[PDB]
Structure formats: structure tokens, C-alpha cells
Amino acid sequence: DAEVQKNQVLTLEDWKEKWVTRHISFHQEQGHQLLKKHLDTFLKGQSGLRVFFPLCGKAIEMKWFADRGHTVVGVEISEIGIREFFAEQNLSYTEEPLAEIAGAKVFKSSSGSISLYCCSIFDLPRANIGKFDRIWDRGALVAINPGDHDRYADIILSLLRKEFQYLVAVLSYDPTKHAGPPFYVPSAELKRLFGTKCSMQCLEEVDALEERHKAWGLDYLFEKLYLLTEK
Ligand SMILES: Nc1ncnc2c1ncn2[C@@H]1O[C@H](CSCC[C@H](N)C(=O)O)[C@@H](O)[C@H]1O
């Protein structure tokens, strides 16, 4: 089952086109769901955290963290999605080109609490963005092409400070029922990618089977939230 979607891809241009065409869906209404349920364990009572959001889209959580005094950085290939974030969140921003990455740009809120890099996550190393106390990964790992898991994991690990908390959600479903994204990422895969370098705790497993998965054609859907910290 783990290899069923192994050769399935969406390309960077495919993702940009989903945004252009409005063929992208955001079923996230109050933010996420198990978002706030575990925010306290994630923050571990600290202030002024530097928090990275891979494949951030226009995630409202980025504004929640910024509102609370944390420094937020996101990466998102779609310029359209990034601009929608600032619009939806009613925030002004600047645009600057990225020297190290052809055609790339960074969009930053006017007082700097949110910086959204418009480029591929795989190009981020060249942008010299430093490291992070926290990484928030909802939808990102499960959006990555299965073939690119190791490349993604390596980048994630390279962006972590020595002490960190990395919150990552994965989805369990029958991979023969649905060609991703989101892709099927079993616990075994999360372990393969991060277990050498991170301690792993399952915080919660919930039954996520609902409405729109009627045309997805799924008999079951579980989402598991994991908290990864230094070994
Ligand atoms: N390699 C890549 N680098 C940067 N962004 C990517 C990417 N591959 C996909 N994306 C973007 O990643 C997002 C994946 S969908 C998840 C969006 C967000 N994490 C949320 O839950 O709200 C899309 O907005 C897509 O345009």
C-alpha cells in the first residue's frame, strides 16, 4: 500500500495552475480543526517563537501566530495564494525579488512579523532564511509528491534549531481509492523520514471521514497528529 502512489506527481506548475484557475479547495473554516486542540503543547508556554509554515497556502494560523508576537515565515509556490493571504487577513505588505533564486520573490507584512517566500520549498536553502524554533505542517507533508519525501524531510530537518517542536498531521486512507494529494503517508513513512533525528509522539488520531469524500470514494479516513522534538 505504501508504494501504490509512489510515482504520482503534481508539478510546481500544476500547483500554480490550481491557484490561477481557482481549482483549489480550502475546507478550512475556523482555521483547521485539531489546530487549537494542541496549540498549548506546541507552544510549550514560550514567547517570540520563530515559526515556519511549509507549503503554507493562505493558512489563517500564520496570522494567529503573528498576532501573538511570534515571527512567521511561510513558503508557497503560488504568488496568487500569497496575495490572497494578505488580502484576506487585511494586512499590507512589501514585495522584493530573491537574488539567489531565479524569478522568486518575498512578500513581507509591513512590520515584518510574516514573510512568505514565493518559490519552491526545494529552493529555500539558497534564500538563507535561518532556522526555526517551531515548524507547523498541516497539509504540507501530505501535499508533497511521494517521490520527493526524502528531499522534503532533509529540508525540514535543516531548518530546525537544536531545540524544536515540529507538529505534523498525516492522513490514513486506502491509497487505491484516490490519487493524491493529499497523499497517503503512514506512520511508518513519517518514522522513516524523521525518526533518526526526532523523538515522535502521536498526539491524537481522529476519524476524519465525512462529506466530500463521497466523491473521493473513501470508506475510511483517519488523521493523526504527531509532535516531533529533538532526540
Ligand atoms: N514544492 C513546493 N514548494 C512550495 N509550495 C508548494 C510546493 N508544492 C506545493 N506547493 C503549494 O503547497 C500548498 C499545498 S496544499 C496545503 C496548503 C496549506 N498548508 C494549508 O493547509 O492551508 C498549495 O498552496 C501549493 O500551491
Side-chain angles (χ1 to χ4, degrees), residues 12 15-16 19 24 26 28 32 54-59 75-78 119-122 138-140 143-144:
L12 294 174
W15 280 111
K16 288 163 51 181
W19 283 94
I24 187 148
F26 311 98
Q28 296 84 249
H32 255 77
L55 279 62
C56 61
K58 56 191 188 180
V75 64
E76 168 53 58
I77 194 62
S78 180
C119 63
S120 178
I121 194 167
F122 305 118
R138 260 82 167 355
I144 294 288

PDB file of all heavy atoms in Angstrom, residues 12 15-16 19 24 26 28 32 54-59 75-78 119-122 138-140 143-144, ligand 1:
ATOM      1  N   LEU A  12       5.222  21.771  -9.906  1.00  0.00           N
ATOM      2  CA  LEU A  12       5.094  23.147  -9.354  1.00  0.00           C
ATOM      3  C   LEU A  12       4.128  23.947 -10.217  1.00  0.00           C
ATOM      4  O   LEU A  12       3.310  24.747  -9.701  1.00  0.00           O
ATOM      5  CB  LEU A  12       6.464  23.847  -9.322  1.00  0.00           C
ATOM      6  CG  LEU A  12       7.548  23.306  -8.395  1.00  0.00           C
ATOM      7  CD1 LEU A  12       8.874  24.051  -8.640  1.00  0.00           C
ATOM      8  CD2 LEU A  12       7.054  23.482  -6.936  1.00  0.00           C
ATOM      9  N   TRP A  15       0.501  23.063  -9.472  1.00  0.00           N
ATOM     10  CA  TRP A  15       0.059  23.755  -8.264  1.00  0.00           C
ATOM     11  C   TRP A  15      -0.255  25.233  -8.559  1.00  0.00           C
ATOM     12  O   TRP A  15      -1.300  25.749  -8.131  1.00  0.00           O
ATOM     13  CB  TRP A  15       1.130  23.671  -7.175  1.00  0.00           C
ATOM     14  CG  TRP A  15       1.143  22.349  -6.432  1.00  0.00           C
ATOM     15  CD1 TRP A  15       2.116  21.379  -6.479  1.00  0.00           C
ATOM     16  CD2 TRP A  15       0.114  21.864  -5.547  1.00  0.00           C
ATOM     17  NE1 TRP A  15       1.764  20.328  -5.633  1.00  0.00           N
ATOM     18  CE2 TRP A  15       0.533  20.590  -5.080  1.00  0.00           C
ATOM     19  CE3 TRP A  15      -1.116  22.392  -5.110  1.00  0.00           C
ATOM     20  CZ2 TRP A  15      -0.214  19.846  -4.156  1.00  0.00           C
ATOM     21  CZ3 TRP A  15      -1.890  21.633  -4.206  1.00  0.00           C
ATOM     22  CH2 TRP A  15      -1.432  20.379  -3.745  1.00  0.00           C
ATOM     23  N   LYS A  16       0.622  25.896  -9.299  1.00  0.00           N
ATOM     24  CA  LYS A  16       0.353  27.302  -9.678  1.00  0.00           C
ATOM     25  C   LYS A  16      -0.959  27.391 -10.453  1.00  0.00           C
ATOM     26  O   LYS A  16      -1.747  28.334 -10.270  1.00  0.00           O
ATOM     27  CB  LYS A  16       1.505  27.877 -10.506  1.00  0.00           C
ATOM     28  CG  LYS A  16       2.776  28.137  -9.685  1.00  0.00           C
ATOM     29  CD  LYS A  16       4.038  28.324 -10.550  1.00  0.00           C
ATOM     30  CE  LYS A  16       3.855  29.365 -11.664  1.00  0.00           C
ATOM     31  NZ  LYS A  16       5.118  29.468 -12.491  1.00  0.00           N
ATOM     32  N   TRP A  19      -4.191  27.304  -8.395  1.00  0.00           N
ATOM     33  CA  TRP A  19      -4.496  28.632  -7.843  1.00  0.00           C
ATOM     34  C   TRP A  19      -5.044  29.599  -8.880  1.00  0.00           C
ATOM     35  O   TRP A  19      -6.062  30.246  -8.630  1.00  0.00           O
ATOM     36  CB  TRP A  19      -3.281  29.248  -7.172  1.00  0.00           C
ATOM     37  CG  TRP A  19      -2.982  28.692  -5.825  1.00  0.00           C
ATOM     38  CD1 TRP A  19      -2.129  27.689  -5.522  1.00  0.00           C
ATOM     39  CD2 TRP A  19      -3.559  29.130  -4.593  1.00  0.00           C
ATOM     40  NE1 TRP A  19      -2.092  27.481  -4.153  1.00  0.00           N
ATOM     41  CE2 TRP A  19      -2.983  28.342  -3.563  1.00  0.00           C
ATOM     42  CE3 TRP A  19      -4.518  30.106  -4.264  1.00  0.00           C
ATOM     43  CZ2 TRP A  19      -3.326  28.498  -2.226  1.00  0.00           C
ATOM     44  CZ3 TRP A  19      -4.855  30.279  -2.915  1.00  0.00           C
ATOM     45  CH2 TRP A  19      -4.255  29.481  -1.918  1.00  0.00           C
ATOM     46  N   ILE A  24      -8.685  24.980  -6.565  1.00  0.00           N
ATOM     47  CA  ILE A  24      -8.052  24.620  -5.312  1.00  0.00           C
ATOM     48  C   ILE A  24      -9.066  24.843  -4.211  1.00  0.00           C
ATOM     49  O   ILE A  24      -9.810  25.823  -4.229  1.00  0.00           O
ATOM     50  CB  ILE A  24      -6.744  25.404  -5.070  1.00  0.00           C
ATOM     51  CG1 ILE A  24      -6.020  24.870  -3.829  1.00  0.00           C
ATOM     52  CG2 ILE A  24      -6.994  26.918  -5.001  1.00  0.00           C
ATOM     53  CD1 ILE A  24      -4.520  24.970  -3.918  1.00  0.00           C
ATOM     54  N   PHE A  26     -10.302  24.994  -0.093  1.00  0.00           N
ATOM     55  CA  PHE A  26      -9.930  25.246   1.295  1.00  0.00           C
ATOM     56  C   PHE A  26     -11.129  24.980   2.191  1.00  0.00           C
ATOM     57  O   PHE A  26     -11.960  25.863   2.426  1.00  0.00           O
ATOM     58  CB  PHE A  26      -9.437  26.683   1.476  1.00  0.00           C
ATOM     59  CG  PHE A  26      -8.419  27.097   0.460  1.00  0.00           C
ATOM     60  CD1 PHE A  26      -8.795  27.828  -0.658  1.00  0.00           C
ATOM     61  CD2 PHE A  26      -7.090  26.735   0.608  1.00  0.00           C
ATOM     62  CE1 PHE A  26      -7.863  28.203  -1.600  1.00  0.00           C
ATOM     63  CE2 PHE A  26      -6.154  27.104  -0.329  1.00  0.00           C
ATOM     64  CZ  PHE A  26      -6.543  27.839  -1.436  1.00  0.00           C
ATOM     65  N   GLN A  28     -11.046  24.621   5.146  1.00  0.00           N
ATOM     66  CA  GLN A  28     -10.647  25.135   6.450  1.00  0.00           C
ATOM     67  C   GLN A  28     -11.402  26.421   6.777  1.00  0.00           C
ATOM     68  O   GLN A  28     -11.153  27.476   6.184  1.00  0.00           O
ATOM     69  CB  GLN A  28      -9.133  25.360   6.489  1.00  0.00           C
ATOM     70  CG  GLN A  28      -8.310  24.082   6.343  1.00  0.00           C
ATOM     71  CD  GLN A  28      -8.110  23.666   4.890  1.00  0.00           C
ATOM     72  OE1 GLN A  28      -8.649  22.648   4.442  1.00  0.00           O
ATOM     73  NE2 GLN A  28      -7.335  24.455   4.149  1.00  0.00           N
ATOM     74  N   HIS A  32      -8.163  25.387  11.099  1.00  0.00           N
ATOM     75  CA  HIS A  32      -8.224  23.948  10.863  1.00  0.00           C
ATOM     76  C   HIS A  32      -9.257  23.349  11.808  1.00  0.00           C
ATOM     77  O   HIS A  32     -10.351  23.897  11.972  1.00  0.00           O
ATOM     78  CB  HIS A  32      -6.864  23.286  11.100  1.00  0.00           C
ATOM     79  CG  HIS A  32      -6.151  22.893   9.843  1.00  0.00           C
ATOM     80  ND1 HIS A  32      -5.493  23.802   9.042  1.00  0.00           N
ATOM     81  CD2 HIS A  32      -5.980  21.684   9.255  1.00  0.00           C
ATOM     82  CE1 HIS A  32      -4.953  23.171   8.013  1.00  0.00           C
ATOM     83  NE2 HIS A  32      -5.233  21.885   8.119  1.00  0.00           N
ATOM     84  N   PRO A  54       5.729  25.283   6.080  1.00  0.00           N
ATOM     85  CA  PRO A  54       5.997  24.815   4.709  1.00  0.00           C
ATOM     86  C   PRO A  54       4.722  24.746   3.898  1.00  0.00           C
ATOM     87  O   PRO A  54       3.658  24.396   4.453  1.00  0.00           O
ATOM     88  CB  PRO A  54       6.551  23.384   4.924  1.00  0.00           C
ATOM     89  CG  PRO A  54       5.905  22.953   6.238  1.00  0.00           C
ATOM     90  CD  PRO A  54       6.029  24.233   7.079  1.00  0.00           C
ATOM     91  N   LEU A  55       4.806  25.064   2.595  1.00  0.00           N
ATOM     92  CA  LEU A  55       3.645  24.918   1.690  1.00  0.00           C
ATOM     93  C   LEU A  55       2.419  25.583   2.322  1.00  0.00           C
ATOM     94  O   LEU A  55       1.343  24.980   2.476  1.00  0.00           O
ATOM     95  CB  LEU A  55       3.386  23.420   1.376  1.00  0.00           C
ATOM     96  CG  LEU A  55       4.276  22.787   0.290  1.00  0.00           C
ATOM     97  CD1 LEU A  55       5.757  22.785   0.635  1.00  0.00           C
ATOM     98  CD2 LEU A  55       3.784  21.336  -0.051  1.00  0.00           C
ATOM     99  N   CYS A  56       2.586  26.856   2.697  1.00  0.00           N
ATOM    100  CA  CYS A  56       1.630  27.491   3.620  1.00  0.00           C
ATOM    101  C   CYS A  56       0.269  27.875   3.029  1.00  0.00           C
ATOM    102  O   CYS A  56      -0.687  28.087   3.792  1.00  0.00           O
ATOM    103  CB  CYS A  56       2.305  28.724   4.255  1.00  0.00           C
ATOM    104  SG  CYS A  56       2.791  29.988   3.017  1.00  0.00           S
ATOM    105  N   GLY A  57       0.172  27.989   1.699  1.00  0.00           N
ATOM    106  CA  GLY A  57      -1.054  28.474   1.050  1.00  0.00           C
ATOM    107  C   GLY A  57      -1.410  29.799   1.703  1.00  0.00           C
ATOM    108  O   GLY A  57      -0.537  30.642   1.879  1.00  0.00           O
ATOM    109  N   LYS A  58      -2.679  29.975   2.088  1.00  0.00           N
ATOM    110  CA  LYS A  58      -3.058  31.173   2.836  1.00  0.00           C
ATOM    111  C   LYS A  58      -3.529  30.832   4.264  1.00  0.00           C
ATOM    112  O   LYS A  58      -4.474  31.434   4.760  1.00  0.00           O
ATOM    113  CB  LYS A  58      -4.110  31.994   2.066  1.00  0.00           C
ATOM    114  CG  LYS A  58      -5.367  31.185   1.710  1.00  0.00           C
ATOM    115  CD  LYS A  58      -6.271  31.918   0.744  1.00  0.00           C
ATOM    116  CE  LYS A  58      -7.575  31.127   0.619  1.00  0.00           C
ATOM    117  NZ  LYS A  58      -8.492  31.784  -0.311  1.00  0.00           N
ATOM    118  N   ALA A  59      -2.812  29.914   4.915  1.00  0.00           N
ATOM    119  CA  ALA A  59      -3.216  29.354   6.207  1.00  0.00           C
ATOM    120  C   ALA A  59      -3.474  30.468   7.228  1.00  0.00           C
ATOM    121  O   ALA A  59      -2.595  31.262   7.497  1.00  0.00           O
ATOM    122  CB  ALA A  59      -2.132  28.413   6.725  1.00  0.00           C
ATOM    123  N   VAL A  75       6.485  29.303   3.033  1.00  0.00           N
ATOM    124  CA  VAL A  75       6.909  29.163   1.630  1.00  0.00           C
ATOM    125  C   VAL A  75       5.733  28.608   0.816  1.00  0.00           C
ATOM    126  O   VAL A  75       5.043  27.656   1.239  1.00  0.00           O
ATOM    127  CB  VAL A  75       8.192  28.277   1.472  1.00  0.00           C
ATOM    128  CG1 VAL A  75       7.942  26.801   1.917  1.00  0.00           C
ATOM    129  CG2 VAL A  75       8.699  28.313   0.045  1.00  0.00           C
ATOM    130  N   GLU A  76       5.509  29.225  -0.340  1.00  0.00           N
ATOM    131  CA  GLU A  76       4.351  28.900  -1.163  1.00  0.00           C
ATOM    132  C   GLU A  76       4.695  29.254  -2.613  1.00  0.00           C
ATOM    133  O   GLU A  76       5.068  30.381  -2.903  1.00  0.00           O
ATOM    134  CB  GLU A  76       3.147  29.684  -0.647  1.00  0.00           C
ATOM    135  CG  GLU A  76       1.895  29.710  -1.530  1.00  0.00           C
ATOM    136  CD  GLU A  76       1.433  28.314  -1.923  1.00  0.00           C
ATOM    137  OE1 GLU A  76       1.149  27.487  -1.015  1.00  0.00           O
ATOM    138  OE2 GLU A  76       1.358  28.034  -3.156  1.00  0.00           O
ATOM    139  N   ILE A  77       4.547  28.280  -3.519  1.00  0.00           N
ATOM    140  CA  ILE A  77       4.899  28.488  -4.926  1.00  0.00           C
ATOM    141  C   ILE A  77       3.947  29.487  -5.621  1.00  0.00           C
ATOM    142  O   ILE A  77       4.354  30.208  -6.568  1.00  0.00           O
ATOM    143  CB  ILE A  77       4.978  27.085  -5.680  1.00  0.00           C
ATOM    144  CG1 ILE A  77       5.671  27.213  -7.061  1.00  0.00           C
ATOM    145  CG2 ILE A  77       3.599  26.458  -5.852  1.00  0.00           C
ATOM    146  CD1 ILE A  77       7.071  27.671  -6.981  1.00  0.00           C
ATOM    147  N   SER A  78       2.680  29.536  -5.184  1.00  0.00           N
ATOM    148  CA  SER A  78       1.700  30.436  -5.827  1.00  0.00           C
ATOM    149  C   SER A  78       1.747  31.863  -5.311  1.00  0.00           C
ATOM    150  O   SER A  78       1.376  32.123  -4.161  1.00  0.00           O
ATOM    151  CB  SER A  78       0.274  29.923  -5.648  1.00  0.00           C
ATOM    152  OG  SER A  78      -0.624  30.819  -6.294  1.00  0.00           O
ATOM    153  N   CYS A 119       8.423  30.695  -3.886  1.00  0.00           N
ATOM    154  CA  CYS A 119       9.431  29.864  -4.534  1.00  0.00           C
ATOM    155  C   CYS A 119       9.128  28.441  -4.107  1.00  0.00           C
ATOM    156  O   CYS A 119       8.235  28.201  -3.249  1.00  0.00           O
ATOM    157  CB  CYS A 119      10.860  30.237  -4.064  1.00  0.00           C
ATOM    158  SG  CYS A 119      11.238  29.983  -2.301  1.00  0.00           S
ATOM    159  N   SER A 120       9.865  27.499  -4.693  1.00  0.00           N
ATOM    160  CA  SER A 120       9.735  26.096  -4.261  1.00  0.00           C
ATOM    161  C   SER A 120      10.405  25.872  -2.919  1.00  0.00           C
ATOM    162  O   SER A 120      11.501  26.380  -2.686  1.00  0.00           O
ATOM    163  CB  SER A 120      10.359  25.147  -5.292  1.00  0.00           C
ATOM    164  OG  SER A 120      10.272  23.785  -4.851  1.00  0.00           O
ATOM    165  N   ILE A 121       9.784  25.069  -2.055  1.00  0.00           N
ATOM    166  CA  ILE A 121      10.453  24.686  -0.813  1.00  0.00           C
ATOM    167  C   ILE A 121      11.849  24.105  -1.075  1.00  0.00           C
ATOM    168  O   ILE A 121      12.758  24.273  -0.264  1.00  0.00           O
ATOM    169  CB  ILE A 121       9.610  23.744   0.089  1.00  0.00           C
ATOM    170  CG1 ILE A 121      10.231  23.689   1.493  1.00  0.00           C
ATOM    171  CG2 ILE A 121       9.436  22.311  -0.540  1.00  0.00           C
ATOM    172  CD1 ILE A 121       9.311  23.050   2.547  1.00  0.00           C
ATOM    173  N   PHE A 122      12.020  23.431  -2.212  1.00  0.00           N
ATOM    174  CA  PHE A 122      13.312  22.796  -2.508  1.00  0.00           C
ATOM    175  C   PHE A 122      14.404  23.768  -2.873  1.00  0.00           C
ATOM    176  O   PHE A 122      15.612  23.411  -2.822  1.00  0.00           O
ATOM    177  CB  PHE A 122      13.138  21.759  -3.617  1.00  0.00           C
ATOM    178  CG  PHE A 122      12.084  20.737  -3.283  1.00  0.00           C
ATOM    179  CD1 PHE A 122      10.951  20.608  -4.064  1.00  0.00           C
ATOM    180  CD2 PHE A 122      12.219  19.954  -2.161  1.00  0.00           C
ATOM    181  CE1 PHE A 122       9.968  19.653  -3.745  1.00  0.00           C
ATOM    182  CE2 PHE A 122      11.221  19.000  -1.824  1.00  0.00           C
ATOM    183  CZ  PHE A 122      10.109  18.879  -2.606  1.00  0.00           C
ATOM    184  N   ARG A 138       0.630  21.194   8.434  1.00  0.00           N
ATOM    185  CA  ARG A 138      -0.707  20.689   8.190  1.00  0.00           C
ATOM    186  C   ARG A 138      -0.835  20.779   6.681  1.00  0.00           C
ATOM    187  O   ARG A 138      -0.658  21.875   6.076  1.00  0.00           O
ATOM    188  CB  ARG A 138      -1.746  21.614   8.811  1.00  0.00           C
ATOM    189  CG  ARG A 138      -2.305  21.139  10.142  1.00  0.00           C
ATOM    190  CD  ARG A 138      -1.387  21.496  11.294  1.00  0.00           C
ATOM    191  NE  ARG A 138      -1.984  21.350  12.625  1.00  0.00           N
ATOM    192  CZ  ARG A 138      -3.255  21.035  12.876  1.00  0.00           C
ATOM    193  NH1 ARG A 138      -4.112  20.835  11.879  1.00  0.00           N
ATOM    194  NH2 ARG A 138      -3.674  20.935  14.138  1.00  0.00           N
ATOM    195  N   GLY A 139      -1.110  19.660   6.052  1.00  0.00           N
ATOM    196  CA  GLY A 139      -1.336  19.693   4.630  1.00  0.00           C
ATOM    197  C   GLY A 139      -0.041  19.690   3.838  1.00  0.00           C
ATOM    198  O   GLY A 139      -0.071  19.312   2.689  1.00  0.00           O
ATOM    199  N   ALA A 140       1.099  20.030   4.439  1.00  0.00           N
ATOM    200  CA  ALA A 140       2.335  20.199   3.650  1.00  0.00           C
ATOM    201  C   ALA A 140       2.987  18.849   3.333  1.00  0.00           C
ATOM    202  O   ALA A 140       3.111  18.476   2.165  1.00  0.00           O
ATOM    203  CB  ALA A 140       3.307  21.130   4.381  1.00  0.00           C
ATOM    204  N   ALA A 143       0.975  16.948   1.026  1.00  0.00           N
ATOM    205  CA  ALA A 143       0.894  17.516  -0.332  1.00  0.00           C
ATOM    206  C   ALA A 143       2.105  17.205  -1.216  1.00  0.00           C
ATOM    207  O   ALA A 143       2.014  17.262  -2.446  1.00  0.00           O
ATOM    208  CB  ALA A 143       0.718  19.050  -0.253  1.00  0.00           C
ATOM    209  N   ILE A 144       3.225  16.888  -0.592  1.00  0.00           N
ATOM    210  CA  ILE A 144       4.489  16.629  -1.293  1.00  0.00           C
ATOM    211  C   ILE A 144       4.378  15.335  -2.112  1.00  0.00           C
ATOM    212  O   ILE A 144       3.760  14.379  -1.664  1.00  0.00           O
ATOM    213  CB  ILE A 144       5.642  16.513  -0.243  1.00  0.00           C
ATOM    214  CG1 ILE A 144       5.851  17.867   0.455  1.00  0.00           C
ATOM    215  CG2 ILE A 144       6.985  15.991  -0.841  1.00  0.00           C
ATOM    216  CD1 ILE A 144       6.497  18.917  -0.445  1.00  0.00           C
TER     217      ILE A 144
HETATM  218  N1  LIG B   1       7.346  22.363  -3.741  1.00  0.00           N
HETATM  219  C1  LIG B   1       6.517  23.345  -3.315  1.00  0.00           C
HETATM  220  N2  LIG B   1       7.035  24.490  -2.849  1.00  0.00           N
HETATM  221  C2  LIG B   1       6.252  25.484  -2.432  1.00  0.00           C
HETATM  222  N3  LIG B   1       4.924  25.352  -2.440  1.00  0.00           N
HETATM  223  C3  LIG B   1       4.331  24.228  -2.880  1.00  0.00           C
HETATM  224  C4  LIG B   1       5.125  23.185  -3.329  1.00  0.00           C
HETATM  225  N4  LIG B   1       4.283  22.209  -3.698  1.00  0.00           N
HETATM  226  C5  LIG B   1       3.030  22.609  -3.482  1.00  0.00           C
HETATM  227  N5  LIG B   1       3.049  23.860  -3.002  1.00  0.00           N
HETATM  228  C6  LIG B   1       1.869  24.669  -2.530  1.00  0.00           C
HETATM  229  O1  LIG B   1       1.590  23.959  -1.269  1.00  0.00           O
HETATM  230  C7  LIG B   1       0.208  24.059  -0.919  1.00  0.00           C
HETATM  231  C8  LIG B   1      -0.191  22.594  -0.687  1.00  0.00           C
HETATM  232  S1  LIG B   1      -1.919  22.430  -0.145  1.00  0.00           S
HETATM  233  C9  LIG B   1      -1.746  22.891   1.655  1.00  0.00           C
HETATM  234  C10 LIG B   1      -1.848  24.417   1.984  1.00  0.00           C
HETATM  235  C11 LIG B   1      -1.629  24.838   3.469  1.00  0.00           C
HETATM  236  N6  LIG B   1      -0.554  24.062   4.131  1.00  0.00           N
HETATM  237  C12 LIG B   1      -2.949  24.700   4.217  1.00  0.00           C
HETATM  238  O2  LIG B   1      -3.256  23.636   4.769  1.00  0.00           O
HETATM  239  O3  LIG B   1      -3.730  25.666   4.249  1.00  0.00           O
HETATM  240  C13 LIG B   1      -0.501  24.684  -2.139  1.00  0.00           C
HETATM  241  O4  LIG B   1      -0.828  26.057  -1.834  1.00  0.00           O
HETATM  242  C14 LIG B   1       0.526  24.585  -3.270  1.00  0.00           C
HETATM  243  O5  LIG B   1       0.494  25.699  -4.186  1.00  0.00           O
END
